[PDB]
Amino acid sequence: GAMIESSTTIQVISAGLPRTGTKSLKNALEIIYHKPCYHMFEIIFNKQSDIIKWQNLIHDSHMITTLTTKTIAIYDKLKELLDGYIATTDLPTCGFYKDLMNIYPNAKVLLTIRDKYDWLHSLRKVVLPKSNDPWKLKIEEGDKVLGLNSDFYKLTEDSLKFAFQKDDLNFDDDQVLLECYDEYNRLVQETVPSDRLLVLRLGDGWEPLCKFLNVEIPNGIDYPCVNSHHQMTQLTEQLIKYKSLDAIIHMFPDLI
Ligand SMILES: Nc1ncnc2c1ncn2[C@@H]1O[C@H](COP(=O)(O)O)[C@@H](OP(=O)(O)O)[C@H]1O
Numbered sequence: 001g002a003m004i005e006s007s008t009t010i011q012v013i014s015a016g017l018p019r020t021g022t023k024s025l026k027n028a029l030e031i032i033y034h035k036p037c038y039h040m041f042e043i044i045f046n047k048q049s050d051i052i053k054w055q056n057l058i059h060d061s062h063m064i065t066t067l068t069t070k071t072i073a074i075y076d077k078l079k080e081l082l083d084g085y086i087a088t089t090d091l092p093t094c095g096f097y098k099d100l101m102n103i104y105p106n107a108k109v110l111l112t113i114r115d116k117y118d119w120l121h122s123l124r125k126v127v128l129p130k131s132n133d134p135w136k137l138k139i140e141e142g143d144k145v146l147g148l149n150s151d152f153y154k155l156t157e158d159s160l161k162f163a164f165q166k167d168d169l170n171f172d173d174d175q176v177l178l179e180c181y182d183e184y185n186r187l188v189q190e191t192v193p194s195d196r197l198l199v200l201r202l203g204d205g206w207e208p209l210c211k212f213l214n215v216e217i218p219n220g221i222d223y224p225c226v227n228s229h230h231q232m233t234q235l236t237e238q239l240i241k242y243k244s245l246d247a248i249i250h251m252f253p254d255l256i
């Protein structure tokens with residue numbers, strides 16, 4: 001097809017929870033739009049200074065009215081954080097999908113989903129290990145190497161609570177997490193008009209996404225398949241071994 005000049009503003013809002021193919025989608029959207037897409041990896045690797053800003057936003061967000069003046073101050077902060085990006089995925093953004101829809105009325109919405117038990121397994125291996133899991137200690141050691149500490153974990157927890165609309169949450173309780181997952185995904189599909197929503201199951205690939213976005217399928221490029229828990233386990237172990245990201249970054253070309 002013809003090449004057109006795309007606007008550098010949020011065009012795609014992905015409401016999918018972590019461990020549902022968000023990093024592959026981030027990569028896919030960057031392949032399509034040639035501009036950056038937000039993801040937790042953008043925070044970890046490029047903008048750790050954004051952590052406190054996301055924290056402050058989540059703190060003030062109860063004050064959001066489904067526009068009031070308190071709402072506008074928050075919406076302005078959201079726009080500031082996302083300036084220069086063409087899409088959002090992953091925590092901490094995903095819980096804000098409804099607000100992002102108001103801020104970017106011409107953006108389309110995605111929902112990434114998968115088998116709930118596969119999701120929980122993946123989540124426990126990477127994002128939210130049980131407190132008694134020895135692996136949690138390795139994750140914390142690798143996080144230290146990346147310069148992530150208690151503030152990062154607070155952002156992860158608070159943004160999960162915000163997405164699930166819980167004031168507190170037993171993170172070690174599998175049943176609680178699975179119920180929140182199902183209710184979260186159900187609410188997105190109830191909230192977003194079907195014409196503005198595309199639901200993507202893990203493995204769906206380029207075709208329905210490119211159709212929804214009115215773009216050609218990228219020539220000769222496979223749909224990304226990155227960020228498996230096995231790959232993150234390798235990353236964690238290599239970070240612990242070398243004590244730096246930059247010593248090993250070349251060994252993870254598309255993941256980071
Ligand atoms: N193109 C693809 N096809 C199938 N699974 C994919 C995929 N891209 C990513 N995934 C899976 O999506 C999960 C990562 O999601 P996210 O980037 O949101 O954290 C991983 O699940 P597993 O940990 O079960 O392997 C990864 O394997």
Ligand SMILES: CC(C)NC[C@@H]1CCc2cc(CO)c([N+](=O)[O-])cc2N1
Pocket residue numbers: 018019022040041090091126127138139140141142143155156232235236239
């Ligand atoms: C040892 C090192 C590999 N650990 C860092 C990890 C890996 C990637 C990651 C991804 C997400 C959501 O994509 C979240 N999250 O939900 O906040 C936390 C983390 N933390």
